[PDB]
Design a protein around this ligand. Structure first.
Ligand SMILES: *[C@@H]1O[C@H](CO)[C@@H](O[C@@H]2O[C@H](CO)[C@@H](O)[C@H](O)[C@H]2NC(C)=O)[C@H](O)[C@H]1NC(C)=O
Ligand SMILES: *[C@@H]1O[C@H](CO)[C@@H](O)[C@H](O)[C@H]1NC(C)=O
Ligand SMILES: *[C@@H]1O[C@H](CO)[C@@H](O)[C@H](O)[C@H]1NC(C)=O
Ligand code: NA
Ligand code: NA
Ligand code: NA
Lengths: 189, 13, 182
């Protein structure tokens, strides 16, 4: 479709610090690719981001009931909504699946790779550590980082550069809020 | 419990 | 000092399509959206709807204001249309793939605008729709969108897969391939 498009987009954002001790509320407006005006609860009034938003800064700051609604949002909206879904969002805990498999370097390098795949977990914060004969490996540890699956789950692949010897025991160890004890998967050459 | 909508307001014409 | 969590109410209205969306996002995940055609709240995971509620009428009333605001902003901009930004497309699996153990292909579409796409899943060059699912248009810290599409499948050495993405910023539909390794 070659037809020109026109987009109006808004985000009302609630940023939470130390539970709900401090809340920062942002009411943002975008026309096409441009953020033109916003209300920041720290500021206390609307402010134009660009020239395009100057008429709204002037007009919305003069709308008494609207500005007070925005000023009350941290409690009536942010803190309210935080509490509504708290049990299944903030307190959501989904335990990981830990899979260990060797992988060949392409083309062959001096080392091969040992993959620790940690999947299907929630929240995103995780600790994945490689061990060789009960000693942590800091060198040769490569990760593509935290991958969001878009379905309230995350995954991560943590690789260890290895020179695999006859009787070496490799251990991937996972710590995550969903589990009280470190999870381990052993691999032998 | 109900999620609350933050109500939209018409821009300056 | 860093924030622990973010809740976003994201909404848009788009002309000439006359399409709009209203959704809530928690740390990058869709909690729910409003089905505009059915005038109903659609929960991302069924358990959410058992624990919380949302009146769709409030989203519908906001969308009407978003539409009025689009008309005002379109005139104020001197009728400037959007410049299309094509998406980055990544295809991954939910977990490492094992032969004949069901798995899920994930097509992640990111950093694009306007929020309009046509997404097709291709198995050996053929369209497949069995058990497919998707998110609505998800917010980013910028003016850009993200979206996920899902295809559950039984892994085999024979079958190949493609996620075909159409966007107005793309000269030709973008195909991202996946096939079983070794
Ligand atoms: C997604 O698919 C449709 C159809 O191929 C495209 O939009 C138009 O839809 C109607 C029929 O339902 C046709 O009259 C038009 O011819 C279609 N436009 C074109 C150029 O064929 C639509 O453009 C596609 N959306 C995206 C983002 O590519
Ligand atoms: C969280 O808020 C309260 C305020 O009384 C305080 O006791 C506590 O130290 C705070 N924690 C952090 C990490 O700031
Ligand atoms: C719109 O038109 C007016 C008057 O000619 C001008 O001052 C303004 O810069 C224009 N804005 C844009 C985004 O083109
Ligand atoms: Na800023
Ligand atoms: Na309520
Ligand atoms: Na594998």
């Amino acid at each position: 479709d070659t037809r020109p498009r026109f987009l109006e987009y808004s985000t009302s954002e609630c940023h939470f610090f130390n539970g709900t001790e401090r809340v920062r509320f942002l009411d943002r407006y975008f026309y096409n690719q441009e953020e033109y005006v916003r209300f920041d609860s720290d500021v206390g009034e609307f402010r134009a981001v660009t020239e395009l938003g100057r008429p709204d800064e002037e007009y919305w700051n003069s709308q008494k009931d609207f500005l007070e609604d925005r000023r009350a949002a941290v409690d009536t909206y942010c803190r309210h909504n935080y509490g509504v879904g708290e049990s299944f969002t903030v307190q959501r805990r989904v335990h990981p699946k830990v899979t260990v498999y060797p992988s060949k370097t392409q083309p062959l390098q001096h080392h091969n790779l040992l993959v620790c795949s940690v999947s299907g977990f929630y929240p995103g914060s995780i600790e994945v550590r490689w061990f060789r004969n009960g000693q942590e490996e800091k060198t040769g540890v490569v990760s593509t980082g935290l991958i969001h699956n878009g379905d309230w789950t995350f995954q991560t692949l943590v690789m260890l550069e290895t020179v695999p010897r006859s009787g070496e025991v490799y251990t991937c160890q996972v710590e995550h809020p969903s589990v009280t004890s470190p999870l381990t998967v052993e691999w032998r050459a | 419990r109900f999620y609350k909508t933050l109500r939209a307001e018409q821009a300056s014409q | 000092i860093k924030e622990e969590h973010v809740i976003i109410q994201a909404e848009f209205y788009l002309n000439p399509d006359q399409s709009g969306e209203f959704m809530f996002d928690f740390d990058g995940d869709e909690i729910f959206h409003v089905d505009m055609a059915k005038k109903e709240t659609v929960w991302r995971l069924e358990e959410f709807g058992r624990f919380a509620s949302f009146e769709a009428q409030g989203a519908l009333a906001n969308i009407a204001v978003d539409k009025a605001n689009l008309e005002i902003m379109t005139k104020r901009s001197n009728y400037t249309p959007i410049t299309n930004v094509p998406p980055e497309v990544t295809v991954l699996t939910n977990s490492p793939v094992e032969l004949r153990e069901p798995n899920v292909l994930i097509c992640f579409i990111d950093k694009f605008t306007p929020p309009v796409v046509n997404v097709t899943w291709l198995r050996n060059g053929k369209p497949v729709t069995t058990g497919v699912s998707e998110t609505v248009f998800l917010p980013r810290e910028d003016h850009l969108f993200r979206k996920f599409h899902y295809l559950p499948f039984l892994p085999s050495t024979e079958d190949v897969y493609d996620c075909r993405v159409e966007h107005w910023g793309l000269d030709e539909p973008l195909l991202k391939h996946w096939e079983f390794d070794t």
